[PDB]
Amino acid sequence: TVFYTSIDIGSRYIKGLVLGKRDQEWEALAFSSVKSRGLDEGEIKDAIAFKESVNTLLKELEEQLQKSLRSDFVISFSSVSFEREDTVIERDFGEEKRSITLDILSEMQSEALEKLKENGKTPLHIFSKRYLLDDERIVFNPLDMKASKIAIEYTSIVVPLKVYEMFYNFLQDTVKSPFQLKSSLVSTAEGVLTTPEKDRGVVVVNLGYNFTGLIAYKNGVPIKISYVPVGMKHVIKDVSAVLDTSFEESERLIITHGNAVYNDLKEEEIQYRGLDGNTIKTTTAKKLSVIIHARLREIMSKSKKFFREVEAKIGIPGGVVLTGGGAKIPRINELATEVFKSPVRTGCYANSDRPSIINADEVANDPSFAAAFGNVFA
């Protein structure tokens, strides 16, 4: 039995998921969420706290498994700095054609890694590799073929070297086991999209806490990646300010009585506690939603800019897939549809076309665990 440990580092929560899989059968063996600490705006501002948070999650997963967790880990994190890039490496053997082997390919990839590094970048996903042989034909896998010259174009999702190094350094101390770092946005897409969607054209909108991630796929790979610097944090802050209550009460109101659509809400008074935690105040489900609605529409509107740019390139066919904590707000798909004027659906592992996983229903249907699953099926 092979264990596939996965952790997704978010701005508010660090998710953990351990999958195990028979010859052709997958099941969730452990899962949990711990509040992120030491992280601020995607940056580790307190490594001591950060490491404690990760360690707490690891202990929880081991407690569930009743077993030490030492298999290779796949760990993802969020950043507004993810970017798409192209890198080309060439090797010329001359007139005497040679056999392209694994060692030469491994050596050339190293050259690509070095080149990016010199430009202050580290690749997290090398999702496309094209091999031009003898300045003539292009192949998808050069192994077992003979060429006198080979050029390789690597397309990838990168992050600044400093960002990469911070996470790698600090995790290496906590996760005393080998691991690979990934983009939470990329893994989210991999965890929720269907192959036809990735092939024909689709856009993923990750409604995260600090910001909203944007990624588009076409021909099976990411063709554009970006973000909107507005997230669920702003929705909560708005409610907190207008109703004059705490961050905690605002989020409680949003989760329990919030709706992305307010224009058809029936009258319903709702009580909540003031900042002193004693004074009772009153509002209505409609007034609450008016606040939520306004900020969510700003996010969607600013996201439409990305949508139109993608539509200009081709993500028309598959429409939009909403993920992340915000995708859980009631009827947010309806608001999204109004804004993008395209089909919109909620993304979660259960609705992707990835291998069905048993006894994972809870997390498999949770948009917030998308990246955790995606990390494995990458």
Neighbours of 119 (CB within 10 A): 11
Tokens, residue 231: 């997230």
Known binding residue 94? Answer is no
Go through the chain and tell me how many residues it has.
Answer: 378
Known binding residue 15? Answer is yes
Neighbours of 2 (CB within 10 A): 9
Are 286 and 199 a contacting pair, CB within 8 Å?
A: no
Rounded to the nearest 5°, which phi and psi values hold at 245? -145, 180
Half-sphere exposure of 166 (CA within 13 A, CB side): 17
Q: Report the C-alpha gap between 106 and 117 in whole angstroms.
A: 16
10 Å CB burial of residue 214 (0-12, 13-18, 19+) is: buried
Known binding residue 129? Answer is no
Tokens, residue 111: 């050259």
Return the residues preceding each gap in the chain, C–N over 2.5 A, or none: 314
In DSSP terms, 221 is beta-bridged to 218
Known binding residue 4? Answer is no
Known binding residue 338? Answer is no
Tokens, residue 174: 């906590």
Known binding residue 11? Answer is yes
CA 217 to mean position of chain CA atoms: 14
Question: Considering only CA atoms, which of 115, 116, 114, 145 is closest in space to residue 131?
Answer: 145
Neighbours of 71 (CB within 10 A): 14
CA 56 to mean position of chain CA atoms: 22
Known binding residue 287? Answer is no
Known binding residue 356? Answer is no
Neighbours of 245 (CB within 10 A): 21
Name the binding residues: 11-13, 15, 78, 209, 251, 325
Name the binding residues for ATP: 11-13, 15, 78, 209, 251, 325
